[PDB]
Design a protein around this ligand. Structure first.
Ligand SMILES: *[C@@H]1O[C@H](CO[C@@H]2O[C@H](CO)[C@@H](O[C@@H]3O[C@H](CO[C@H]4O[C@H](CO[C@H]5O[C@H](CO)[C@@H](O)[C@H](O)[C@@H]5O)[C@@H](O)[C@H](O[C@H]5O[C@H](CO)[C@@H](O)[C@H](O)[C@@H]5O)[C@@H]4O)[C@@H](O)[C@H](O[C@H]4O[C@H](CO)[C@@H](O)[C@H](O)[C@@H]4O)[C@@H]3O)[C@H](O)[C@H]2NC(C)=O)[C@@H](O)[C@H](O)[C@H]1NC(C)=O
Ligand SMILES: *[C@@H]1O[C@H](CO)[C@@H](O[C@@H]2O[C@H](CO)[C@@H](O[C@@H]3O[C@H](CO)[C@@H](O)[C@H](O)[C@@H]3O)[C@H](O)[C@H]2NC(C)=O)[C@H](O)[C@H]1NC(C)=O
Ligand SMILES: *[C@@H]1O[C@H](CO)[C@@H](O[C@@H]2O[C@H](CO)[C@@H](O)[C@H](O)[C@H]2NC(C)=O)[C@H](O)[C@H]1NC(C)=O
Ligand SMILES: *[C@@H]1O[C@H](CO)[C@@H](O[C@@H]2O[C@H](CO)[C@@H](O)[C@H](O)[C@H]2NC(C)=O)[C@H](O)[C@H]1NC(C)=O
Ligand SMILES: *[C@@H]1O[C@H](CO)[C@@H](O)[C@H](O)[C@H]1NC(C)=O
Ligand SMILES: *[C@@H]1O[C@H](CO)[C@@H](O)[C@H](O)[C@H]1NC(C)=O
Ligand SMILES: *[C@@H]1O[C@H](CO)[C@@H](O)[C@H](O)[C@H]1NC(C)=O
Ligand SMILES: *[C@@H]1O[C@H](CO)[C@@H](O)[C@H](O)[C@H]1NC(C)=O
Ligand SMILES: *[C@@H]1O[C@H](CO)[C@@H](O)[C@H](O)[C@H]1NC(C)=O
Ligand SMILES: *[C@@H]1O[C@H](CO)[C@@H](O)[C@H](O)[C@H]1NC(C)=O
Lengths: 106, 105, 132, 52, 52
């Protein structure tokens, strides 16, 4: 299967700061198959960024990101209360697996 | 001309004057529309809601306030238009981001 | 208002069967591909599988660890998606969710595909359970 | 199951067709005879209809 | 090289034209006589053809 890991496991940033998250695929899966979700605890996950680029419908413009082979990144230009959630990256490399979940905290 | 002593047999329903009248009226009707605007740019999905007015029970609902994106003079421009439609002129389909389309598209 | 109305979950034991399902609300499913993802308490998100619409041909894709005992099917006509479970393991307790992507292209003109407003909606259900 | 005589004679093509509404498109999957299509602009799988 | 009598008579206009295919587009430019175009939406460079 496809294994994704995340770093740092927990982020500790104040609202207003740039809460950048990173993750890694063990497999080299093209960025076209990359997605990054935000899961508020108790809720279904919500896609932020797909194709390691394009923004999903509804999603605020504070969100952006990029990546290539195994190296992927998520940018929150300014952290807001709405972002204190667990984030997951996913790779659609014929098995759409996800990382363990990265917590954004203060 | 009165024809004082002429008796003749008539038979409506077998009278071919009827068929000619039928064909000429229809033909003229069609000819009158030849130079008129063809509303093909308007076969788009609509977003229909209710009318913001005092509507009596006999009118409930009978009218809808529909918005749509119309083409305009330039091909690289588009415009927002809304208008009122009778319920009988629209069909409750589409079921996407929007509600209803025009009956004959 | 694309909604997935999820139901049929409950308390089951491995020595049994369970079918979870989602029904379309607002927006239909015969024109959409759907999948299931599960999250055991304390765990991250695990993809179970994906089924395509009967259009491309009801083709399925499954994660290795759930094959055989977890299968996926569609009705399409009644807009209902199903996750069919039989002979489950003690490892299978999780909240299962259905989800779908909606790719909608609003073309400005019926003559030139250059001009459109494209929107991508990621839609998830509420989550129901499979237990041990 | 294609006999030798028919290899390369038929192609299975997928195109985006217009629809009843001006702002919508659909995805249609049809068979064509090879003689009715032409490959184009150095793209391995990209074809257009012979007389466009 | 424009003589005095011709200053302002010709303009070099670029636009996006359709092609033989519904999903393919091309950049085209051409020269126009000033009398055939009209300025629009308060932009120095934005012109359209007189009869649209
Ligand atoms: C007829 O029309 C066809 C329309 O199909 C569309 O094709 C365009 C490209 O032409 C795609 O646009 C590009 O998408 C890129 C990212 O999309 C990726 O992720 C999608 C996510 O969906 C997944 O997650 C869902 C849950 O979250 C899940 O439910 C779902 O099942 C899935 O797992 C994928 O769907 C998507 O795959 C599709 O696109 C691929 C190409 O990218 C195709 O190879 C593939 O077959 C699929 O069609 C993909 O993995 C995105 O990164 C691109 O952005 C680029 O352009 C942006 C500006 O537009 C720019 O800002 C970016 O930087 C970048 O340059 C781009 O948006 C549409 O998503 C795709 N729609 C569908 C159906 O998904 C067309 O494919 C076909 O060729 C046409 N036919 C003919 C003959 O002309
Ligand atoms: C005509 O064209 C315009 C512009 O393309 C369409 O505008 C769209 O209007 C819808 C409904 O308000 C917008 O949906 C909203 O999207 C936001 C996120 O973007 C979401 O948070 C809201 O809940 C809602 O879903 C849509 O984004 C908007 N598009 C743009 C780019 O402005 C309009 O619908 C078209 N009209 C018809 C009848 O087709
Ligand atoms: C139909 O809907 C339109 C909006 O799409 C309504 O128009 C607006 O009306 C408010 C007052 O209530 C004005 O302040 C806005 O400026 C108007 N907008 C536009 C674009 O004109 C319209 O009144 C509705 N009509 C009916 C009969 O319900
Ligand atoms: C022909 O189309 C291109 C796009 O393919 C136009 O270039 C874009 O112009 C907008 C502003 O209207 C910019 O925001 C985009 O960043 C540009 N994109 C690219 C790829 O350059 C171009 O202007 C059009 N030609 C004419 C004459 O209007
Ligand atoms: C609708 O009826 C109420 C009385 O019930 C009246 O006060 C209001 O002005 C009316 N609105 C319109 C648009 O006529
Ligand atoms: C719109 O009108 C219909 C028909 O009269 C009615 O059933 C519906 O509840 C009305 N909706 C709103 C928001 O007024
Ligand atoms: C297609 O040909 C293969 C041999 O290459 C054969 O085994 C298979 O049964 C054939 N399928 C059909 C539908 O005839
Ligand atoms: C498809 O047909 C071409 C001839 O037009 C041939 O060269 C190619 O090898 C064929 N590919 C397959 C998978 O049969
Ligand atoms: C164009 O005009 C300039 C003067 O502005 C002149 O020097 C130049 O030689 C002219 N070009 C040609 C080809 O004669
Ligand atoms: C274009 O030519 C006119 C007429 O000579 C002149 O007034 C104008 O400033 C010129 N503009 C540019 C950008 O050269």
């Amino acid at each position: 299967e496809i294994v994704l890991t995340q770093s740092p496991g927990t982020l500790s940033l104040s609202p207003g700061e740039r809460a950048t998250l990173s993750c890694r695929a063990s497999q080299i899966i093209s960025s076209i198959y990359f997605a990054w979700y935000q899961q508020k605890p108790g809720q279904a996950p919500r896609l932020l960024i797909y194709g390691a680029s394009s923004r999903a419908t509804g999603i605020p413009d504070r969100f952006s990101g990029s990546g290539s082979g195994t190296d992927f990144t998520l940018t929150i230009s300014r952290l807001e209360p709405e972002d204190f959630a667990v984030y997951y990256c996913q790779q659609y490399g014929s098995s759409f697996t996800f990382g363990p979940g990265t917590k954004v905290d203060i | 001309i009165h024809l004082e002593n002429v008796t003749e047999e008539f038979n409506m329903w077998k009278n071919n004057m009827v068929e000619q009248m039928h064909e000429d009226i229809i033909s003229l009707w069609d000819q009158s529309l030849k130079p008129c605007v063809k509303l093909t740019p308007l076969c788009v999905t609509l977003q229909c809601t209710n009318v913001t007015n005092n509507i009596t029970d006999d009118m409930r609902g009978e009218l809808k306030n529909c918005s749509f994106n119309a083409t305009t003079e330039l091909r690289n421009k588009r415009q927002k238009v809304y208008s009122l439609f009778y319920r009988l002129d629209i069909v409750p389909m589409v079921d996407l981001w929007t509600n209803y389309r025009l009956i004959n598209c | 208002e694309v909604q997935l109305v999820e139901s049929g979950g409950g308390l089951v034991k491995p020595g049994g069967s369970l079918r979870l399902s989602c029904t379309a609300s607002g927006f239909t499913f015969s024109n959409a591909w759907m999948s299931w993802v599960r999250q055991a308490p304390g765990k991250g998100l695990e993809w179970v599988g994906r089924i395509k619409s009967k259009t491309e041909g009801g083709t399925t894709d499954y994660a290795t660890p759930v094959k055989g005992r977890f299968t996926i099917s569609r009705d399409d006509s009644k807009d209902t998606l199903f996750l069919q479970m039989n002979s489950l393991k003690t490892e299978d307790t999780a909240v299962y969710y259905c989800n779908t992507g909606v790719e909608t292209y609003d073309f400005w003109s019926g003559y030139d595909d250059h001009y459109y407003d494209y929107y991508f909606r990621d839609v998830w259900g509420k989550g129901t359970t499979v237990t041990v």
